[PDB]
Design a protein around this ligand. Structure first.
Ligand SMILES: Cc1cc2nc3c(=O)[nH]c(=O)nc-3n(C[C@H](O)[C@H](O)[C@H](O)COP(=O)(O)OP(=O)(O)OC[C@H]3O[C@@H](n4cnc5c(N)ncnc54)[C@H](O)[C@@H]3O)c2cc1C
Ligand SMILES: Nc1ncnc2c1ncn2[C@@H]1O[C@H](CSCC[C@H](N)C(=O)O)[C@@H](O)[C@H]1O
Ligand SMILES: Nc1ncnc2c1ncn2[C@@H]1O[C@H](CSCC[C@H](N)C(=O)O)[C@@H](O)[C@H]1O
Lengths: 230, 582
């Protein structure tokens, strides 16, 4: 037993599942053993870039939208930057904001509803376990989300997100709700039951904000998702 | 379902319900006319035409290797111009071997659409189509001429319809009709075609009247009688060709609208007769963007979305020099090689010794050459009073994006920095910008500053001496006709001067600087001194020896500024070089 007590001994509701993400999104106290440094999806500590949006992620996951990775809108930082920088020196580095998460089944309706106004700017992709696949993405084509331009060189594009790779990743992206977390609990115990109601019948989601010279809209998508549900 | 060439391409438009247009031309009897018509093919291609049809006659030697011959005109339309063509063919006074040889030659030239014609004095187009199918299978498109008001040689119209049945069922793919004067005639013979089991799509042909010779030309071509209404309209204006052009445009617009609104017409064939204005106006009245180069090439070149910037003021030589390739670049340019040098036209749109009045008959010194570049860039008339339309490297008026590089560019060019290609830094403008908005309409477009020029031995030396003060920021490349090569670019890698960011797509980089393909542009760039401007002068003269000295000893230089969100340093590097001189 290493991560059980860090993820909580007994889950009273989905709120006890939300309470595991916020204690990963900040170093914070717990009923026993304090800080948790891991989730099934998130074996790295938060990258230094995450400090730009840590307060937003804490807000988002405390509202029940269960973020499992992100990026900010960077708009051409120097390559040498210790927070957001890579490749040859002196060049530039760019990003699109990114927000990948799970939600309660009722919340996916809410998200699709609010995307009816942002479906030009925000590339979105929702998927339930067994298959229920909704997107505004180009049918086939990958979306580039981190790229860089370097003195005397070709454009480098290290981070890309796309509907085929996402539909493949989904088959692991649900399995470890059981294989890592759910397998800790007793057979059909109230914790296992609320985890199974979170494994099955629950939407994995991806969002990308394409308009990177602007402030990141993904927080407003989630705020309006919440508002709508409310 | 899947789609391919042949009927499936036009079946795509049929299913999508998109109306299209096609143009049909004639081969000229002179080489100059051939060049003019090739330029015309380039100009019409932007009108979104389905295909180009080239007529065939035996008196003009169409199967021969003369440039005026129809076969080479069609080949130039496709291979060296990038436009799909449909080749007409007639087999009167021809044998099996001749037809087979001509069809094989069409094979070798990439020609894949063939029109079957019987001509006027192998007895029928049925034999031609059947022989084509038997000897070359289904590799080629086959289309047969249709006769709505019946063949003049035929006793009965129903017999003509039956012969059309047989010809279509033999090997034909599409049917093209001749001139008309009433729309209802289209409908009646279309219904006849349907009722006889002919299921191929029928496309109507249109002759746009443009002059008084059109009436005689129309009568001779179609053997039909002009209606008394049109003649009476034309008779009182028998010497106002321009007015008849407007009247014919109106009549053609009415006919085309009636044809299209029917829904049985998938497209239109227009008999241009090697005339542009009326056809273009008609097409516009009936109702460019994917890359900063306004068209990517058609034949075997759907893959091209990156090419080197060097040729971008002169694109048709790049297409011609690269026609050997299969690896037409898509992705990071990283592969296609111009391991090539060639025999040529090297002719402007102005005649061979006509533009001498704009470049000057008499070069006094290099300081006269320096004004020809500046007169071009300024749009200013020469000492003769003639505005310079082009220079040997750049047959165009230079682009709207280079209006940002007007006053500074011509200012530094006066000083012996003879610029032949250039570009602004852009810093992430929205897509659909008026001067740099290429690609998908949502997104952003980005560019580095670029400058390319010839310059003197002294000024090149100076610049080599200076660039050390910017060499972290400026990639530079310098070469001469002697092959002396000096450059500061990493491992000779390409340099991505333009790119765009678009929702849901990977990053797109449509133009690139490349120090290896600059070795292949170099030879073309220097040779365009002697082979267009030197040879425009007499064989031993001040003007020839001046141009041969410029060819012999100027450096060719290219610079790129990598700090694209900051102000351009190419302005304030050549000025940092002018200072040093003194
Ligand atoms: C779109 C178009 C393009 C043209 N292009 C050219 C060109 O490139 N070069 C050129 O020289 N001319 C061309 N012409 C002119 C054309 O070739 C003439 O109309 C010519 O006189 C006959 O050619 P055809 O294919 O229409 O002949 P066909 O369709 O074969 O018709 C000619 C006559 O053959 C008779 N016939 C056909 N099959 C039979 C049969 N099985 N049994 C008995 N009788 C039969 C018909 O009754 C008809 O009157 C073109 C015409 C059109 C409309
Ligand atoms: N549950 C969670 N909520 C928010 N962010 C998370 C998260 N789990 C991981 N992350 C962060 O999401 C980031 C995605 S990393 C992939 C993109 C990468 N930064 C690049 O541009 O190359 C990680 O760096 C990590 O710090
Ligand atoms: N004599 C001359 N001096 C300066 N620039 C010239 C020139 N002749 C042509 N040019 C310009 O050279 C540029 C090269 S193409 C520039 C790159 C490309 N348009 C892009 O897609 O980003 C053209 O804009 C052309 O107009």
């Amino acid at each position: 037993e290493e991560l059980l007590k860090m993820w909580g001994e007994e889950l009273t509701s989905e709120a006890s599942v939300f309470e595991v993400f916020v204690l990963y999104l900040s170093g914070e106290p717990n009923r026993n053993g304090h800080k948790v440094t891991c989730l099934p999806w998130n074996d790295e500590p938060l990258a230094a870039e995450t400090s730009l949006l840590k307060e937003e992620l804490l807000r988002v996951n405390r509202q029940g939208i269960l973020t499992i990775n992100s990026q900010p809108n960077i708009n051409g930082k120097p390559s040498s930057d210790p927070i957001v920088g890579w490749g040859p020196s002196g060049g530039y580095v760019f990003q699109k904001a990114y927000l990948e998460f799970f939600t309660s089944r009722e919340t996916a309706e809410a998200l699709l509803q609010v995307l009816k106004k942002y479906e030009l700017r925000v590339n979105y992709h929702l998927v339930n376990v067994k298959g229920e696949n909704i997107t505004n993405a180009p049918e086939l084509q990958p979306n580039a989300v981190t790229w860089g331009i370097f003195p005397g060189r070709e454009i480098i594009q290290p981070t890309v997100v796309d509907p085929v790779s996402f539909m493949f990743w989904k088959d692991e992206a649900f399995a470890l709700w059981i294989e890592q977390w759910g397998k800790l609990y007793e057979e059909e115990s109230p914790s296992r039951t609320i985890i199974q109601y979170i494994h099955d019948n629950y939407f994995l989601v991806n969002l990308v904000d394409n308009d990177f010279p602007l402030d990141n809209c993904l927080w407003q998508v989630v705020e309006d998702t919440l508002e709508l549900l409310n």
